[PDB]
Amino acid sequence: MHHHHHHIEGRLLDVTPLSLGIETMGGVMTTLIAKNTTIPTKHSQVFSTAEDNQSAVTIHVLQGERKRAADNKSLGQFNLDGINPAPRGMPQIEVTFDIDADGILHVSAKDKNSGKEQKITIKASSGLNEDEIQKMVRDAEANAEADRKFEELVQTRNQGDHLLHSTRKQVEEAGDKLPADDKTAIESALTALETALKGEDKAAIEAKMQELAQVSQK
Amino acid sequence: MHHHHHHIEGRVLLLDVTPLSLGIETMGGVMTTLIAKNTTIPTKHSQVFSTAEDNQSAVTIHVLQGERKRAADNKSLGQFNLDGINPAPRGMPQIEVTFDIDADGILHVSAKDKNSGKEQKITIKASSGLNEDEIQKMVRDAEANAEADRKFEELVQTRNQGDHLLHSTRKQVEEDDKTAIESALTALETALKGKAAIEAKMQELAQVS
Ligand SMILES: C(#C[P+](c1ccccc1)(c1ccccc1)c1ccccc1)c1ccccc1
């Protein structure tokens, strides 16, 4: 009398062996469920569109926590289409990761307007063994440098690609008044920006961003 | 007859049919229809597929919807992977793919390996979805393309068979005198990248076998 309490720990219904999440722009993994999360676990988070007016969206499920989603694993994949046109970014899609007591995974994507949604339910039945996942963890903690660095690069290449397409917009879609010689300028600007962002170097791509930035004046 | 013949009809409550033929991508990026368009539901269809190479490890079940024969000419739906299957030559393992649909729109994709015992199953639903205008458009354009896609199917069928032949050849050689067979190979594959001249190529590699 009263309020006699103490602290808590994990429930034991087994923890996740490896982190789960989806793939975002730049081919990078964003973890929606951290490694060793005691289940049943439901995480809700809201992503959105990369490009203008795109009518669909893909959700690619991952495991094996590491950046560069192609270096992780693929649990499943699916689409959500029929969505209404909006400029790049900011429609509202809602991604939900659910795991019940049976460890069977449920991924869902919803739309604020629309309301056309999809979902997947993954029954496993095979999975993996401690050895393999330990190899994945080891390889992950060895590659942490190039991983985080790659994340940085993805952020950058995203900014530069977005700025570039926005420059193509603000050039062609913008008035055709066409100040003299603008052609060559923004042409090799945005083009060198292209063949820069195609390959991967941070310094080169941002430099090219500046090169296209100075000529974007008028 | 003689008791009651009085034959049957498709069972439908109201709206329940598959509007689009549901299928799975196979080689050469060609759609293999597991459940045809305009099929009453519930409906379940099972088939057996297999690997394109020895010890292929995992495999990608790719679920699509549309009437087009080509991969990209359709609208994808979902996909997943079945891994951890034993070493074995092409076509040797039996991989069972199952498309289920119940009274709802919800579909169950099963994939199993009879020999390995390994199984993986996923569950998604029906359409993504997409508006009826779209679907009607894809259908109209499908009827449009038609025989072109048919020739595409015959094509990928050949190219797949011939590729199987080339793999079987190089594998049978273990590189004699096969020099003639090797440059005839290189030529035949050079043609194999880009119609009936491919069948001719198969004939040519068969002759110098
Ligand atoms: C479908 C459907 P749908 C439907 C509703 C209720 C019961 C069975 C099927 C549907 C409707 C709304 C959202 C999602 C699916 C349907 C309804 C009317 C016409 C065509 C299809 C479908 C089924 C198989 C493959 C692709 C699509």
From Swiss-Prot, chain B:
PTM annotation (N6-succinyllysine): residues: 125, 151, 201
Phenotype of the disrupted gene, per the record: Non-essential; synthetic lethality is seen in a triple tig-dnaK-dnaJ disruption, although this depends on temperature (triple disruptions grow slowly at 20 and 34 degrees Celsius but not at all at 43 degrees) and strain background.
Location(s), subcellular: Cytoplasm; Cell inner membrane
Post-translational modification: Autophosphorylated; GrpE inhibits the autophosphorylation. Can be UMPylated on a tyrosine residue by SelO/YdiU, probably under stress conditions.
Disulphide connectivity of cysteines: none
Modified residues (N6-acetyllysine): 44
Sequence similarity: Belongs to the heat shock protein 70 family.
Stated role: Plays an essential role in the initiation of phage lambda DNA replication, where it acts in an ATP-dependent fashion with the DnaJ protein to release lambda O and P proteins from the preprimosomal complex. DnaK is also involved in chromosomal DNA replication, possibly through an analogous interaction with the DnaA protein. Also participates actively in the response to hyperosmotic shock.
Protein name: Chaperone protein DnaK
Gene name tied to this protein: dnaK
